Symmetry: D2
Subunit: 224 residues, 4 copies
């Protein structure tokens, strides 16, 4: 946890399939873990240009960079040096389903991400396959302890050309490679996220993304 | 329209429905401060009590006029008067239970009148809802966005269980105004932070008092665009 | 108790999205041959602003031909009768729940059904009335919790070709105690539900169903 | 197209992926009678064995060329050769497990070659899959229908459980031919009856032999139209 500095660098490898299209990506970036901000510069290195909106891959590119406010125990930062994993299913309301699994490790002071993606049943005439998307709205995730890890739930809204949205729901399981005796678990909490596309080029084979993420309790008054 | 909604408002409600195959009716009366986003409801199970399922699965079906819209967010619900509005929802529990609910909201002699219809099916007969192992809801954030001249809402809610766990459910809501579109200023995407709390119960949950605070906001995180 | 010929009467009420409605019907069929006809009237809320097809499956489990000696949970439930509850999820977001009570009063089968559908998209084929009835389907039934559960996918034909798929999950509960019921194991019902006649923007509808229960007759290595 | 698929065919397969963060690899070989709908596959877990999860969840990912198409139903799979075809699938278990799979089917020197990738998530640790308390699959009927120059399939499958009862799952499949649509005669709606059986196993499911029979038909029920 004192392994995680005020500025940290990251590198990533990603591969998988969406429908029948194979691809690979790599990225590099940096952020301030305690401030909850980060930047990633991404290259589609195989299978580009993608025949699907890049927005569906956006959330798969970094949990160490969440500002855990209010003394909330930090499952992610606490996991180092052992590191951690995550597994997710994202279900779009028009049929697309994307699962993703991820390994996070720390090697010579650099965070190293290895991601796998498997997307299926995206409608060939819907807005993902037809590239009619304009990035994600901000969202709140709820995290709660479950099976010795953390589970997360959120709904995210994918902006469409013309002003509408396509909604998706995701369910994540976060697992620490640190033995449970050395981790103090949080209770229920919330993470507010704003994931933004900063730059793109060459039919989204180059993308720059930024994320700000701040964890908190619910601050509403309680009658109890 | 907004002028019809005063600083202090009373409510009256009728509910009937089924869960699994158990029929029930409820009645309630309450009061709140619509602009401050707080309300209290005192609820009676008048038929089919004691219910064989956790009253918690009905708790979110008992009041959208009572949201504090911060930051100038246009208020779809308050703007709807005097015509009023309706809502429809499906709540899906991760162990199989599915609860649909439809609701009519009207203003009648300065009283808010709720008529609610519930149909819940396929709760597991040996799960925590049917065996009454629940302890109320965690706080939650709902996302609301415009769709089809109305609003839709999405949230995930966590139902606390005896022993420390949670059972998660997801709900998808459509809110429809009875006011003609040309007379509504529509909001964009926004968020509502909610805390629904049970304050009293008696007689195997045939008498229940609930309180809700709801506060609407934009996302306050800084943006790079 | 359940004779070779049987008549039926039904009341239905409910809501889809925000549209309230009521229907009634009568028909007859042959419970042992798995066939039945129902003539159906929309008596309040007509004409419906949604495709009647979404209601078709809610209008009769006593009329399934249970072959090969499969213990027939439905027919054994008399005179006490039985209920069912269902959720149908459409792949474009419509969700319809339905609960039903089936009783036998003075030789006639009596049905009381309640419908609540939500979230049907206003541009989709259901709310546009651009559907052309159901394909045939096979339902899987299996014992669970002292009742039976059913699983099927159904394909709703669309004006202009293609289909909209839905999935349903059904729970069938007997009003007769467990100890006076022989339970089946896993089995399958083949169904063909067709519309014979409509009139007056679907406010009158005639429907026929044939339903036959069977085991799987593929050969087994075990 | 169909001329390349003989009365007897051989298959080889490679599989890899992950279920709840356990990585694994499998190989298989086998043979069958494509036009009679029968086939046998002998499978080795070559990396990650013994698996911490019921092998039953992988069984449906190990061969669409082996469907007996009765009644003149145009056979999308056999017509796709020599180019071959792919499939993609999501299987949703009623206790939360989700398994996505994608497959490449090709024909090389008269051998069918299968390349399969598997990604399973959220299988509950005290459920039957992760506790390895399953006893194979019931028979099932799949519905197939054309959609967008492809074929989609829908089915519910019942997984037999140690102690009696079943865990139910649903799957949604998309089959895509590599052959241009120009050269394919598409079927309409039809049905496939399946019976997938475990014939033998050894060494804690690191060796498994499976058989499948699959027969396509229309519905034989009389029609009133």
């Amino acid at each position: 946890e004192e392994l995680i500095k005020e500025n940290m660098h990251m590198k990533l490898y990603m591969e998988g399939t969406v429908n029948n299209h194979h691809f690979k990506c790599t990225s590099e970036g940096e952020g301030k873990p305690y401030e909850g901000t980060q930047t990633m510069r991404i290259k589609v290195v195989e299978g580009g240009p993608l025949p699907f909106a890049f927005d569906i891959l956006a959330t798969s590119f970094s949990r160490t960079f969440i500002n855990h406010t209010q003394g909330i125990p930090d499952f992610f930062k606490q996991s180092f040096p052992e590191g951690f994993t995550w597994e997710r299913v994202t279900t779009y309301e028009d049929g697309g389903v994307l699962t993703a699994t991820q390994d996070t490790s720390l090697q010579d002071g650099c965070l190293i991400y290895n991601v796998k993606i498997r997307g299926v049943n995206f409608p060939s005439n819907g807005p993902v396959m037809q590239k009619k998307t304009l990035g994600w709205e901000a969202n709140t995730e709820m995290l709660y302890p479950a099976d010795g890890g953390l589970e997360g739930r959120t709904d995210m809204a994918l902006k469409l050309v013309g002003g509408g949205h396509l909604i998706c729901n995701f369910k994540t399981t976060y697992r620490s490679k640190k033995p449970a005796k050395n981790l103090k678990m949080p209770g229920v909490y919330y993470v507010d996220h704003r994931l933004e596309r900063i730059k793109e080029a060459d039919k989204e084979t180059y993308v720059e993304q930024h994320e700000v993420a701040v964890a908190r309790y619910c601050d509403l008054p309680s009658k109890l």
